Amino acid sequence: AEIQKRVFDQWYANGTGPLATNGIEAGVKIRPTPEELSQMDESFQEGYREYFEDKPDKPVMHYSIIAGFFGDHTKIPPGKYMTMFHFLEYPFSRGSIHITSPDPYAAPDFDPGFMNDERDMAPMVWAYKKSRETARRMDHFAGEVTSHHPLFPYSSEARALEMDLETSNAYGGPLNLSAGLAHGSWTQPLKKPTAKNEGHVTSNQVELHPDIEYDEEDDKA
Amino acid sequence: AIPEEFDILVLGGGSSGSCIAGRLANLDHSLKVGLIEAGENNLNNPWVYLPGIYPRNMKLDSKTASFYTSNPSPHLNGRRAIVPCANVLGGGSSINFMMYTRGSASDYDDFQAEGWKTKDLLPLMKKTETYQRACNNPDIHGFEGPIKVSFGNYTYPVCQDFLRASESQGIPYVDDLEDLVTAHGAEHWLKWINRDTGRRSDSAHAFVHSTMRNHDNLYLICNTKVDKIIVEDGRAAAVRTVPSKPLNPKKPSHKIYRARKQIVLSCGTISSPLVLQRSGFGDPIKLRAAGVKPLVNLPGVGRNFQDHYCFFSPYRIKPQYESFDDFVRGDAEIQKRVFDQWYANGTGPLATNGIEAGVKIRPTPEELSQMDESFQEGYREYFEDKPDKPVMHYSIIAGFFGDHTKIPPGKYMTMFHFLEYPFSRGSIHITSPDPYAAPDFDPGFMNDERDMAPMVWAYKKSRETARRMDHFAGEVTSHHPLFPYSSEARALEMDLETSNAYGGPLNLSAGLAHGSWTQPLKKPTAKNEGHVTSNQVELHPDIEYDEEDDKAIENYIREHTETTWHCLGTCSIGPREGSKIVKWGGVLDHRSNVYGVKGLKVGDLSVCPDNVGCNTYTTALLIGEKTATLVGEDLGYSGEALDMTVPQFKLGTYEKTGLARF
Amino acid sequence: AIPEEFDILVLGGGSSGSCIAGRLANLDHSLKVGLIEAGENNLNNPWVYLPGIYPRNMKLDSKTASFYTSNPSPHLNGRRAIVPCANVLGGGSSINFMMYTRGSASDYDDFQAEGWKTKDLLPLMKKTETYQRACNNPDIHGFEGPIKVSFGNYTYPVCQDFLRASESQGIPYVDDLEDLVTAHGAEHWLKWINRDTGRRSDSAHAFVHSTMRNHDNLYLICNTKVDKIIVEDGRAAAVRTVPSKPLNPKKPSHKIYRARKQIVLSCGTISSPLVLQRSGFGDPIKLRAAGVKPLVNLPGVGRNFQDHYCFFSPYRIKPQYESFDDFVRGDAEIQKRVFDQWYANGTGPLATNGIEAGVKIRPTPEELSQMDESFQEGYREYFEDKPDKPVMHYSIIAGFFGDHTKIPPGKYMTMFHFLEYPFSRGSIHITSPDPYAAPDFDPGFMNDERDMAPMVWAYKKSRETARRMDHFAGEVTSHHPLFPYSSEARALEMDLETSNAYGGPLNLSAGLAHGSWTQPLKKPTAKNEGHVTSNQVELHPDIEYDEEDDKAIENYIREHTETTWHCLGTCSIGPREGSKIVKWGGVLDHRSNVYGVKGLKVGDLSVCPDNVGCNTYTTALLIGEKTATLVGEDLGYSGEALDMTVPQFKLGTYEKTGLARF
Ligand SMILES: Cc1cc2nc3c(=O)[nH]c(=O)nc-3n(C[C@@H](O)[C@H](O)[C@H](O)COP(=O)(O)OP(=O)(O)OC[C@H]3O[C@@H](n4cnc5c(N)ncnc54)[C@H](O)[C@@H]3O)c2cc1C
Ligand SMILES: Cc1cc2nc3c(=O)[nH]c(=O)nc-3n(C[C@@H](O)[C@H](O)[C@H](O)COP(=O)(O)OP(=O)(O)OC[C@H]3O[C@@H](n4cnc5c(N)ncnc54)[C@H](O)[C@@H]3O)c2cc1C
Ligand SMILES: [Ca+2]
Ligand SMILES: [Ca+2]
Ligand SMILES: [Ca+2]
Known part of the structure; x- marks a missing residue:
């Protein structure tokens, strides 16, 4: 209530503030490198030659960063988030739609055809890995929401890693009685990133999280 | 000052340990009893006696627990399971879920040990508790014991x-x-809750703090970790301890405490075998692999977990x-x-x-x-x-x-x-x-x-x-x-x-x-x-x-x-050569004595050769009452001396006394 | 475990029922007494014992009441009146307005039943209550009973x-x-309020919970609805029950409880006749129209409401x-x-x-x-x-x-x-x-x-x-x-x-x-x-x-x-052939026995052949004390045994004891 009040108050005052944006502030159009292509399904490699190779101005995937969680907040833990929003630019899949009766109110017979062509899978998988790597290299990054990520094998080194103990306590507040209560093993914690290079100028220092390697089980997930 | 020599030494002041130390101090008040505990004192600590806040003890940064790591297991799909246990006076009883549960009669019979049958242990089961609720079967419950159990006040x-x-x-x-x-x-x-006070019931307050408040022969030594037990002429004679927090690496300290009559090891299922192994009790090959000189060949120590x-x-x-x-x-x-x-x-x-x-x-x-x-x-x-x-x-x-x-x-x-x-x-x-x-x-x-x-x-x-x-x-x-x-x-x-x-x-x-x-x-x-x-x-x-x-x-x-x-079983009662349920070899006889040495008993959940169909605080208390009795008998006491009644003001039920909560 | 066979079975733990069960359990503690109740247990429930919140029990979505619908009536300008009643241990006494009111002396005389005259019942009236206020006529009030009455604490x-x-x-x-x-x-x-505690006075806490907390022969069976009473060789021998919530339609369950010595029906004015009718007691034509095989011709059951x-x-x-x-x-x-x-x-x-x-x-x-x-x-x-x-x-x-x-x-x-x-x-x-x-x-x-x-x-x-x-x-x-x-x-x-x-x-x-x-x-x-x-x-x-x-x-x-x-009258005391006030025929004799069967009494408000000039909790309690005495006499008890005193810690008045509230 209080945050909504302040956000509306600023907008009423002079039309500025969080109410005057969509929170979708940056994004990307991408094409695969020839090396990346060689790692994808043969079906999409062929699809790329047929559709994209002689059309150098067409992107294969888009994704952008949303300054919050887009989705149902009653089904995600408390705290603050950012969301990678991806979509496939030129799918090979096709669907159809047709009326069921002359009743104008009647629900149509609808087959959108999402992902029914095998060529459409590889770019999506590719984009998830790409945006995840982007996310882990952002200053904002503090962890991965396991319930809303691929269901990797539990002990895979590609698994989703949640915010650590200190961050959990920060979000839980000073009165919490269960932040960092690990019993149940519902999540696994992010490890500390690499240390800053003390021999560098402060504004060029970084703390890095590890790159992720995927095997076939991970890709399946 | 804390004496360097006691008559009786109890190592680990947990659910069993505090009970054992308290009972033994009331066996005979001329006996000097020392209770050594690695965790903090819990006397009148609200973070212990307020029931409703109990989940915070399992936060990974909790001061009241230790979090033991384990090897990766394919049966847990690669997980290295974390096994917490108490790190505080009172042990588990200071931080548990407060669920009251008893095992089945066959559980203790199936220990296959003389004197540990349910028929033998039943009066000791009743001895511990004051049963603060409606009872249709009072013959198998207690109404005078220092540990109060109830449905709480909500x-x-x-x-x-x-x-x-x-x-x-x-x-x-x-x-x-x-x-x-x-x-x-x-x-x-x-629940392990006294409805009269609305407080958690733990072994330290029930057996130790009550005793220390009215007698002088019980000594409390917290923040002190037991390293190993020292044997002299086949007798458990002393204990080497170190601070629980090594705050001076330049010159590490240690203390030695001696026992004249008896040592009881009650550091819990996870920790008791570690103490024994550091003392030279175990598999000689494994002990040498860990840099310890073997003393007694007991391959069962740490097995049967x-x-x-x-x-x-x-x-x-x-x-x-x-x-x-x-x-x-x-x-x-x-x-x-x-x-x-x-x-x-x-x-x-x-x-x-x-x-x-x-x-x-x-x-x-x-x-x-x-x-x-x-x-x-x-x-x-x-x-x-x-x-x-x-x-x-x-x-x-x-x-x-x-x-x-x-x-x-x-x-x-x-x-x-x-x-x-x-x-x-x-x-x-x-x-x-x-x-x-x-x-x-x-x-x-x-x-x-x-x-x-x-x-x-x-x-x-x-x-x-x-x-x-x-x-x-x-x-x-x-x-x-x-x-x-x-x-x-x-x-x-x-x-x-x-x-x-x-x-x-x-x-x-x-x-x-x-x-x-x-x-x-x-x-x-x-x-x-x-x-x-x-x-x-x-x-x-x-x-x-x-x-x-x-x-x-x-x-x-x-x-x-x-x-x-x-957790239980790492110091199992059974034949030293082994048995069908204790395949790696027994660690204790039916009087809870460690084989190969004199004057040393184990009194905690590591004792159980097979499992019990219950949350294990009742088992810990029972083992405590039993171990105290065993020590008392061994030292030549009998009859009402074995009552070992601890100080307590009984409130009974409201309609009888008007003192208990309505 | 709950026994399958009792000596005495009380059906319905309401204002009368809880009183009857509690008294009878104290008649002789070797007697096994079972109390069956369809609603929830009310033990230490604040939504029962806090007086000021009482109106919420009559919300249509209340868990503590049942809301019986009725046929449209021209006398109510077409309305189908809703008739609520209690659905919880303690019955009405757990959810009532807490108004204390006694009838007139002629009310009970006009029952036209031996032993139910005011002169006979007056000591039983006093027996129930502790009268916590100024009294100019103490000869007709009680000062030691388990139910405390007062002007409250506001x-x-x-x-x-x-x-x-x-x-x-x-x-x-x-x-x-x-x-x-x-x-x-x-x-x-x-008010039906204990001024010492500021709590509501109900039959369950006064007679049942007090007893169960200090004795072992009283058993409590809640969330259990009584279906019918089973007759064997002209004797009320057993009760068939079903869960109050049918949560498994694929395979419905039921239980049978047996009584050796006595069954008392106390399901209240609305429900008791339903139990009798399901048991085959009533008008044969109406029973057959409802799919029940007639057993005893008693057209008075359900009449005279x-x-x-x-x-x-x-x-x-x-x-x-x-x-x-x-x-x-x-x-x-x-x-x-x-x-x-x-x-x-x-x-x-x-x-x-x-x-x-x-x-x-x-x-x-x-x-x-x-x-x-x-x-x-x-x-x-x-x-x-x-x-x-x-x-x-x-x-x-x-x-x-x-x-x-x-x-x-x-x-x-x-x-x-x-x-x-x-x-x-x-x-x-x-x-x-x-x-x-x-x-x-x-x-x-x-x-x-x-x-x-x-x-x-x-x-x-x-x-x-x-x-x-x-x-x-x-x-x-x-x-x-x-x-x-x-x-x-x-x-x-x-x-x-x-x-x-x-x-x-x-x-x-x-x-x-x-x-x-x-x-x-x-x-x-x-x-x-x-x-x-x-x-x-x-x-x-x-x-x-x-x-x-x-x-x-x-x-x-x-x-x-x-x-x-x-509500009262649906199991009226009177001559079986009928009377001027019981036109459709009596259901019970002057000892509250159901006609046509042995070992079955009704003890609740359905008993009254004519009305009483008062809020009816005093009547319910009185019927309870009387019914308990009738059962006791029938089983051969006499003298001080008929006191059936329940556990209580008496506080008296402040100036006498210093224990009661000033
Ligand atoms: C969070 C939690 C919840 C639980 N919930 C329930 C429940 O609801 N109901 C129930 O019945 N049981 C419950 N249990 C289990 C509990 O009953 C334990 O089984 C019981 O405390 C075991 O008693 P001990 O064997 O004496 O070990 P304990 O762990 O109780 O005692 C061992 C003591 O020795 C100390 N110690 C260990 N190593 C040492 C060393 N080297 N030097 C000095 N001291 C050392 C420890 O600090 C500890 O105080 C729970 C346990 C935990 C941890
Ligand atoms: C909301 C409300 C306010 C009231 N206000 C007052 C007041 O201020 N003063 C006053 O004196 N009286 C008041 N009354 C009346 C009250 O005193 C009742 O008349 C009294 O509880 C009747 O007692 P019983 O006949 O024992 O029936 P009860 O309704 O008290 O008891 C019947 C019991 O049988 C159970 N039962 C019913 N059918 C069953 C079945 N098939 N199987 C198992 N169990 C079954 C019910 O759950 C209930 O517990 C009030 C009643 C209500 C409902
Ligand atoms: Ca083309
Ligand atoms: Ca077998
Ligand atoms: Ca007249």
Whole structure:
């Protein structure tokens, strides 16, 4: 209530503030490198030659960063988030739609055809890995929401890693009685990133999280 | 000043240890008794005696627990299970869930040890407790003991809701599920809470602090870790200790305490074998591999590690019902009101554990025929001719137990299950003579194939219970088995209306389905308008599982099974050469003496050669009373001297004395 | 575990039932006593023992009550009256208005049954209670009984205001309106509240929980609905029960409990005949029509249904005076303060029912001459030679009793009336052998023409009382009779100033008359400046009614008369062949035995062949004490054994013991 009040108050005052944006502030159009292509399904490699190779101005995937969680907040833990929003630019899949009766109110017979062509899978998988790597290299990054990520094998080194103990306590507040209560093993914690290079100028220092390697089980997930 | 020499030395002041030290100090007040404990003193600490705040002890940064790591296990799909245990005076009793549960009569008979049969131990069971509730079978309960048990001073309404649901499943209500005989039933669950004061009942306050406040022969030595036991001429003569916090590496310190008459080791199932191994008791090859000179050949030390294997399954409750979720999340106003009520008169949510009802169950012959062949055979071998042993337990918690920062907002109830007599076995062993060093630990969770079927069975059973409760409003998908997305067995979340209720009137995303992260619960069946209103019901569908569903549940168990903190067996009572139940060799005789040395007993849960069908505080107390008696007899005491009554002001019942709480 | 066979079985743990079960368990502690109850256990439930929250039990979605529907009635202008009753251990005593009221001496004499005369029952009346207030007639009150009665720990100022007003009407103040003789008077009204604890007094805590906490022979079986009673060789031998919630339709369950010595049926006036009818006791034609095989020809079962007929009339109070309206409406800060005071020391608004004063009245010969000829004749037949029987009761409630979402904001007081001895009669009968099935129900409210005049009379009387109270600030038009718009008898609302006071300083529509929804109260007469200030008054006008006004009041009664929850008579004591007061035939002999079977008694309000001039908890308790004594005698007990004293810690008065509340 209080945050909504302040956000509306600023907008009423002079039309500025969080109410005057969509929170979708940056994004990307991408094409695969020839090396990346060689790692994808043969079906999409062929699809790329047929559709994209002689059309150098067409992107294969888009994704952008949303300054919050887009989705149902009653089904995600408390705290603050950012969301990678991806979509496939030129799918090979096709669907159809047709009326069921002359009743104008009647629900149509609808087959959108999402992902029914095998060529459409590889770019999506590719984009998830790409945006995840982007996310882990952002200053904002503090962890991965396991319930809303691929269901990797539990002990895979590609698994989703949640915010650590200190961050959990920060979000839980000073009165919490269960932040960092690990019993149940519902999540696994992010490890500390690499240390800053003390021999560098402060504004060029970084703390890095590890790159992720995927095997076939991970890709399946 | 703390003397350097005592008559009796008790190592570890936990659930058993504090009881043993307190009893022995009252055996004869000319006897000097020293109690050594690694954790902090708990005297009048609100973070110990206030029941309702108990979950914070299992935060990973908790000061009141140690968190032992273990080796990766393929049976847990690669997990290195974390096994917590208490790190504070009072041990487990200072930080536990406060569930009161007794084993079955056959459990102690099956120890196969003279003097440890239920018939022998029954008066010691009664000796410990004051049973502060209605009793239809007073012959097997105590009413004068220093440990007070009760239903607390608050009951969440999940209690009778759960009992109605479980009854409809063929699990009969009983007045007392802890009658040492019943293995299939449901009850209102008792607590280790004194209803007169609204405080937690722990071994330190009951046996130690009471004694020290009225006598002079009991000494308390906390923040002190036991390194090893020193043997002189075949007698346990001294103990080497180090500070629990090594704060001066430039010049490390240590102390030596001597015992004239008796040493009792009570450091718990995880730690007691480590002490013995550091003292030169164990497998000579392994001891030498860890840099310790062998003294006594006892390969059983650290072997036969047993536990109960548990898992938690949370459910959505309707917005009008109560839970402790906001309280443990850290809501300031709700915490303030809860504490204010307790300060006022010792009642309210702070004076309960929220674990209000539960179940002991055995499979029907039909249910058995649907399970793994391996467990069917295990059932014939272990359970069929032991009709008083339960296979699974589960109970209802009036809130989510777990990390609230990793679950959505709202209110919950949690099914808490554990396996009563696992076939799996583990082991533990020191890595070096460093008393601080982490041991090599394999708890052995689920490594025997027979242990999987009962757990799967229990999940399905408790889920059916949950869906038949009035409280039920949905299933938390992220914390349930990863069913195939479109399976009719999948977890179904709270519906649109309920989501909006929890989201509040200003929400902008409740019921925003895009992303398909969850699927909604459908409307239940309509009330029968031809029935009397109080008999009308709204029913959710029964669930059918195929092989893919069952596969999901199995992986769920493998990935979220934990210790239930009921670890036992690492210093098993039995023949030194071994036995069918103690294959690696016994560690203690039937008088709890360590083989190969004089004047040394072990008195904690490491003692048990086989498991018990219960939360293990009753077992710890029983072992404590028994061990104290054994020591007393050994030192030549008899008759009323063995009473070892501790100081206590008895309040009885209100209608008799007018002093107890109405 | 709960035994399958008892010595004594009590069915229904209500106001009578809990009393009977508790007493009998203390008759002889070697006797196994089983108490079966359909509702939930009420042990230490704050929603039961906190007095001030009592209205929520009558919310239609309440868990603590059943809401029985009835057939449409032309006498109620087409209404199908809803008849609530308790659905919880303790029965009515767990959820009632807590009004303490005794009948007249002639009431029990007029039962025309041996051993049920007031002279016989008087020691049993005293036996139940501890009378925690000033007593000028201690010979007819008890001071050691387990049920404590008092004025609570808060008194709303409507008390003496009401008494001054009623005195000016010729209704004299008495120290005790419950002296079994006075039929025309006014008093400070007693409560079923223990002033020592500030808690409600109910039968379960007084008789059952106290006993179970100190003895082992009493067993409690809740959430269990009694289906039928099984007869073997002319003896009531067993009871078939089903769960109160049918949660498993695929395979419904049931239990059978056996009794060796005695079965007592105490399911209440509405439910007891249903149990008997399902057991084959009743009218063979009707039983067969309901699918039940007849066993005993007893056409009286379900007949002779009686009740008190009540209605509520709310009034505006001045903004400076107190009521429980904001509390009941759900104001957070006010609820917080009220609970905080109770937690602090058991005092404040939570420790009262807000029903502080009341009246028993008979018409003067002049008043009679103005009423219906039919009631004038009824008065000669029933009341004229019975000078101790009241005709109407009404009392003042310090707030609005009813749905606050359907009445304007502000503060209120409510006149609560009921008819003491209605001539109307109803009946009830099962529709099928299904224990859950709604019965065919005709309560018979107002179907006799003689019952209309007293109700009309009472409305006019209480309205006159209200208008002479200092609290009075207007009449709530929507909840009063629909007088002709311009009648001088019409309801007059609070005036402009008072409306603005309640509306607050920011209101934008208080006193906006457009629409003509209400008409305002005029200024009262001026104070007499020549009088001493404390004797000065401001008077509102007396009201004159014509035939159109009277017509409006009659329709008002027809449309808003309800059960007062005092239902009785469906298992009447009397000659099996019938009598003048039991026309359809008796169901029980003078020892409460059901005709045609051995070992079966009925012990609840269904027993009464004719009505009682009182709220019926005293009657329920009395029937309970009497029934317990009857059973005890039948089983061969005598003398002090028939005391059946239940466990209790007596506190007496403060000046004697120093233990009771000052
Ligand atoms: C969080 C939690 C919840 C639980 N819930 C329940 C429940 O609801 N009901 C129930 O019945 N049981 C419960 N249990 C289990 C509990 O009953 C334990 O089984 C019981 O405390 C075991 O008693 P001990 O064997 O004496 O070991 P304990 O762990 O109780 O005692 C060992 C003591 O020795 C000390 N120690 C260890 N190593 C040492 C060293 N080297 N030097 C000095 N001191 C050392 C420890 O600090 C500890 O105080 C719970 C346990 C935990 C941890
Ligand atoms: C809301 C309310 C307010 C009242 N106000 C007052 C007041 O202020 N003062 C006063 O004196 N009286 C009051 N009364 C009346 C009260 O005293 C009742 O008359 C009294 O409880 C009747 O006692 P019993 O005949 O024992 O029936 P009860 O209704 O008390 O007891 C019957 C019991 O049997 C159980 N039962 C019914 N059918 C069953 C079945 N098939 N199987 C198993 N169990 C079954 C019920 O759950 C109940 O517990 C009030 C009643 C109500 C409901
Ligand atoms: Ca092309
Ligand atoms: Ca066997
Ligand atoms: Ca007459």
